[PDB]
Design a protein around this ligand. Structure first.
Ligand SMILES: Cc1cc(=O)c2ccccc2[nH]1
Length: 273
């Protein structure tokens, strides 16, 4: 893309998107999950490009040229993200995560605090502790013999029986270059994240400074999942959610206009005070 840069972050050379838009705050920080990169956000960036500064960091070993790197977790993702923001001179930002990029977002809210990071948006992030099928998927990702079997089972869950051309292209072309080094790590880090923090809902409730957070999601589609979101929102005045009714796990790809309007609402709320 026209906006892709590379910088040295501590020991590692990381790629990142920066449209270097000169405009009012806040900056929109789009956080990828595990074993994909800024390509997941190409449609969402087009929705936001004109009106906001947009930054998308890629994690260690992530990007157009994936590589083997030493083991790292979401704490390093957070430091890598802040170091890129410091280099760029960004003060105030609205972070937006996909799936297990949420662990990075919630820890980023904690470390950055509510003046720099007054709100956050989490997209399609499993709010409950792993149910058997997802727990099984993580087990296979960590298996050096069965990791691709793991990825195939997740792609099935993510597409949810849809022939969704753009999402299939992301999973089968834009993620094809990621290996056991990434997918194995993703299994290990996510399993440890739930084990250590209990759940995304526990981790958000545990913030020193609670702030406005919206969960926007298309799946899981079952009423039981909507109910845990409604029960959390009813108990926590700062928490909201919207079911986007997109076909796949990837609303940034399949309903980028819908994601964008939630992000614009939060950016507008920050600008008013
Ligand atoms: C791209 C992406 C989405 C996910 O939900 C996920 C789940 C487990 C491991 C890695 C992952 N990576």
């Amino acid at each position: 893309d026209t906006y892709l840069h590379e910088t040295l972050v501590f020991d590692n050379k990381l790629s990142y998107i920066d449209n270097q838009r000169d405009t009012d705050g806040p900056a929109i920080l789009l956080l990828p999950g595990w074993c994909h990169d800024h390509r997941v956000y190409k449609y969402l960036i087009q929705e936001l490009d004109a009106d906001f500064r947009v930054i998308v960091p890629n994690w260690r070993g992530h990007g157009l040229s994936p590589s083997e790197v030493p083991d790292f977790g979401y704490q390093e993702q957070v430091k890598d993200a802040l170091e890129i923001l410091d280099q760029l001179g960004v003060e105030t930002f609205l972070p937006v995560s996909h799936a297990h990029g949420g662990w990075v977002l919630v820890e980023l809210l904690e470390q950055a605090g509510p003046e720099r990071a007054p709100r956050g948006i989490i997209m399609d992030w499993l709010m409950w502790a792993p149910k058997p099928d997802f727990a099984k998927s993580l087990t296979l990702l960590k298996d050096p013999e069965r990791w691709r079997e793991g990825t195939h089972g997740l792609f099935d869950v993510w597409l949810d029986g849809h022939d969704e051309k753009r999402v299939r292209h992301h999973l089968l072309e834009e993620m094809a270059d990621y290996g056991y080094d990434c997918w194995g790590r993703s299994g290990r880090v996510i399993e440890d994240a739930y084990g250590r923090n209990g759940s995304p809902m526990q981790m958000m409730a545990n913030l020193t400074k609670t702030r406005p957070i919206r969960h926007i999601f298309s799946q899981p589609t079952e009423p039981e999942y909507e109910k845990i979101n409604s029960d959390f929102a009813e108990q926590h005045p700062w928490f909201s959610y919207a079911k986007l009714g997109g076909p796949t796990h990837f609303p940034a790809i399949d309903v980028p206009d819908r994601a964008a309007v939630h992000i614009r609402e939060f950016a507008t709320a920050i600008r008013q005070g």
